[PDB]
Amino acid sequence: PYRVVVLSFELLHAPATVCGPKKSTNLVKNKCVNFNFNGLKGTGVLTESNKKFLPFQQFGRDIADTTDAVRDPQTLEILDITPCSFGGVSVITPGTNT
Amino acid sequence: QCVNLTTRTQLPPAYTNSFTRGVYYPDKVFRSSVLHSTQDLFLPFFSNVTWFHVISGTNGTKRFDNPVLPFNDGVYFASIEKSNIIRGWIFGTTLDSKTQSLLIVNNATNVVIKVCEFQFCNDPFLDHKNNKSWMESEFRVYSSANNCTFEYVSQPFLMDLEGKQGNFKNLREFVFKNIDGYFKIYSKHTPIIVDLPQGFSALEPLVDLPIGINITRFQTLLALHRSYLTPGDSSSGWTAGAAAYYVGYLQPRTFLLKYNENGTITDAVDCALDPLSETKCTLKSFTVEK
Amino acid sequence: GIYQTSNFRVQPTESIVRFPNITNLCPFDEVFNATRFASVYAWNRKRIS
Ligand SMILES: *[C@@H]1O[C@H](CO)[C@@H](O[C@@H]2O[C@H](CO)[C@@H](O)[C@H](O)[C@H]2NC(C)=O)[C@H](O)[C@H]1NC(C)=O
Ligand SMILES: *[C@@H]1O[C@H](CO)[C@@H](O)[C@H](O)[C@H]1NC(C)=O
Numbered sequence: 001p002y003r004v005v006v007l008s009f010e011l012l013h014a015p016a017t018v019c020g021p022k023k024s025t026n027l028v029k030n031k032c033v034n035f036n037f038n039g040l041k042g043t044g045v046l047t048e049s050n051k052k053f054l055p056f057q058q059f060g061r062d063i064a065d066t067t068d069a070v071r072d073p074q075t076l077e078i079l080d081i082t083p084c085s086f087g088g089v090s091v092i093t094p095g096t097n098t
Numbered sequence: 099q100c101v102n103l104t105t106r107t108q109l110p111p112a113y114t115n116s117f118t119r120g121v122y123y124p125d126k127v128f129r130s131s132v133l134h135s136t137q138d139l140f141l142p143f144f145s146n147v148t149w150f151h152v153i154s155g156t157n158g159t160k161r162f163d164n165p166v167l168p169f170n171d172g173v174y175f176a177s178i179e180k181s182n183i184i185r186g187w188i189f190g191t192t193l194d195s196k197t198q199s200l201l202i203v204n205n206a207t208n209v210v211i212k213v214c215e216f217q218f219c220n221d222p223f224l225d226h227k228n229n230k231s232w233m234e235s236e237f238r239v240y241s242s243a244n245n246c247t248f249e250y251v252s253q254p255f256l257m258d259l260e261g262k263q264g265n266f267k268n269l270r271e272f273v274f275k276n277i278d279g280y281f282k283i284y285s286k287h288t289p290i291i292v293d294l295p296q297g298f299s300a301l302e303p304l305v306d307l308p309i310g311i312n313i314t315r316f317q318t319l320l321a322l323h324r325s326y327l328t329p330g331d332s333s334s335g336w337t338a339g340a341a342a343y344y345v346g347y348l349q350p351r352t353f354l355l356k357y358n359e360n361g362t363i364t365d366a367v368d369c370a371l372d373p374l375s376e377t378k379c380t381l382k383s384f385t386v387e388k
Numbered sequence: 389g390i391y392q393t394s395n396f397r398v399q400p401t402e403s404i405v406r407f408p409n410i411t412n413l414c415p416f417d418e419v420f421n422a423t424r425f426a427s428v429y430a431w432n433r434k435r436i437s
């Protein structure tokens with residue numbers, strides 16, 4: 001006698017029922033890093049901000065629709081985002097002949 | 099089981115004017131000190147809503163206080179009472195048990211949301227005997243539990259936590275909508291009042307669930323008061339008392355929202371309402387110069 | 389004189405992913421480690437969601 005279990009799952013993806021992903025990861029701070037906190041993706045630096053969020057708020061925004069702050073799902077702490085340093089470069093020369 | 103209601107009653111569906119009520123956070127994002135503009139389903143300002151109220155107390159005629167009401171895209175269900183009678187939002191279907199059916203019966207042992215494919219019953223009314231503990235003995239809304247899809251149990255919902263005074267100890271303001279299938283229920287609780295109040299408020303979101311079904315119209319429910327004092331048939335033998343609750347309707351519209359510095363909504367102005375409007379919205383500022 | 393050549397950008401070092409915790413699992417042990425089984429004919433039809 002062999003005990004056998006049969007498994008059948010449907011398709012068409014519209015009644016999102018069970019699933020998964022999971023696959024959590026540790027946290028970093030004060031360094032440029034790509035983040036996927038809950039589905040939003042971006043690049044910047046992480047720090048602490050005194051601004052507070054309402055209990056139902058997920059992630060903040062600002063004028064000109066930029067992702068300002070995100071709340072970490074694991075700990076529910078307000079974190080801030082600031083991109084890596086970027087800017088133009090200029091060269092000063094006194095003349096190649098001189 | 100379930101019993102068909104009798105002694106049908108017809109009263110005029112009185113009307114009253116809404117005064118800048120029913121504004122809810124459209125998106126789950128945080129802003130501050132910005133006058134954002136949106137466009138979604140809302141309740142138009144100064145809309146004419148269909149008033150309902152519970153009359154014919156004791157066992158005079160007792161009224162049919164819970165008729166069948168249509169559902170297009172949303173409701174602004176409200177409630178003002180003291181004894182916590184309004185419950186049971188049985189809606190979301192064609193009421194023919196054709197597809198998955200929804201109901202919200204709470205303030206039981208715990209707040210629960212039973213959602214099943216049960217075969218319907220013609221007249222719904224929840225038994226609440228005049229005993230020490232009001233036991234919901236008779237689920238007269240259905241007489242079967244043929245199939246079920248989802249079950250929900252939540253501790254906090256419709257909590258009537260207020261002081262002990264004879265005024266109207268609640269002011270419920272719900273918003274029922276189906277975003278392409280997903281049911282999002284926005285709600286809030288308001289302190290007592292001493293007749294819609296001309297005030298401005300925001301509606302915090304609550305738990306949502308996909309389900310996904312065809313929706314035809316709406317039906318409400320009230321707590322019964324059957325007792326041995328009044329001899330009545332199983333169709334109708336309960337004392338009504340006195341209660342009031344309004345019903346509105348939602349539709350697409352364009353709104354302008356002003357956020358506080360903590361992020362709570364503090365003021366809103368409706369577009370396409372008055373000639374003064376469509377100028378306040380256009381300049382994107384609440385103050386307009388000559 | 390003075391001239392502009394190009395720009396410079398710092399590159400991110402690592403990547404991190406987060407999610408709203410993992411406490412909500414599907415009950416599966418009670419099926420695999422079940423007190424009793426079903427017969428060859430007929431079978432229990434369980435629903436997980
Ligand atoms: C996620 O589940 C854990 C299960 O214990 C909750 O407790 C956290 O556990 C982790 C790992 O042991 C700790 O790093 C956290 O400090 C714990 N949280 C607290 C508040 O102490 C945790 O609360 C859950 N996270 C949620 C629900 O967001
Ligand atoms: C640099 O100086 C020399 C010396 O006069 C001159 O011939 C030359 O043209 C100068 N370079 C340029 C780019 O003008």
Ligand SMILES: *[C@@H]1O[C@H](CO)[C@@H](O)[C@H](O)[C@H]1NC(C)=O
Pocket residue numbers: 358359360
């Ligand atoms: C914003 O919240 C703070 C508490 O963090 C409070 O002191 C302040 O009064 C609030 N803003 C307004 C306009 O009331």
